[PDB]
């Protein structure tokens, strides 16, 4: 159901693990039907499951992307949480790192209803 | 005006410095006159500088508190950002620490319009 604080910590950690191995189908399953993705926050929300899958396959398709928590998950009692992490990727044909904070709201089924990924170019390191 | 990504990084870092030193009046002046605070996220919003001042005095006025960033500020291009930090307090007569992520939205005068502090008891260490 609506994840407890401890369950939010578990779910958000699981998200990171799935991104880190690059299981696109498993990531998309975490999302609710009405989910929205704002990534980076400030850009228009992505919605529709096909569209969210296309977003992740575009980002993770190369198969080389890595991700890890860089601090503990902060969770609420209303099914939300926030986490700091770092993504290792490739930009301009070179290895890079991107520092991100994700804010997630889960629904009463334990699926992601809204996600918001905070980062900009100030958070990229070549 | 509406802070750029770099300006958001600067403002949110300054906020941490003000909490760390406990300058309640300076903190309150970083907020818009009609700002809303949700701390912890999940609890009822408090509204306006009078209420926000009372909230920070309750948290910071008594026993002395320390605060520091535990990772970089993640900023957007629409005047928003998110940051991870740790608050050190004295509970009972013994030290405790609280891991928090704040999300802030600034207005076009450079003041905090809204903020959300993500944490729960899972983030406390006595």
Curated annotation (Swiss-Prot), chains A, B:
One GO molecular function term?
A: steroid Delta-isomerase activity
Q: What positions does UniProt annotate as the active site of this protein?
A: 15, 39
Q: Name one GO biological process term.
A: steroid metabolic process
InterPro entries per record: Ketosteroid_isomerase, NTF2-like_dom_sf, SnoaL-like
- Residues involved in substrate binding: 102
Keywords (A to Z) from UniProt: Isomerase, Lipid metabolism, Steroid metabolism
SUBUNIT field: Homodimer.
- Protein name, entry field: Steroid Delta-isomerase
């Amino acid at each position: 159901n609506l994840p407890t604080a401890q369950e939010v910590q578990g779910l958000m950690a699981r998200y990171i693990e799935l991104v880190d191995v690059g299981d696109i189908e498993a990531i998309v399953q975490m999302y609710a039907d009405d989910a929205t993705v704002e990534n980076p926050f400030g850009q228009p929300p992505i919605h529709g499951r096909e569209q969210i899958a296309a977003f992740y396959r575009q980002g993770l398709g190369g198969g080389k992307v890595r991700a890890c928590l860089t601090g503990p998950v902060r969770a609420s009692h209303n099914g939300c949480g926030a986490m700091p992490f770092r993504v290792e990727m490739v930009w301009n044909g070179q290895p890079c790192a991107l520092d991100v904070i994700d804010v997630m709201r889960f629904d009463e089924h334990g699926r992601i209803q809204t996600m918001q990924a905070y980062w900009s170019e100030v958070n990229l390191s070549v």
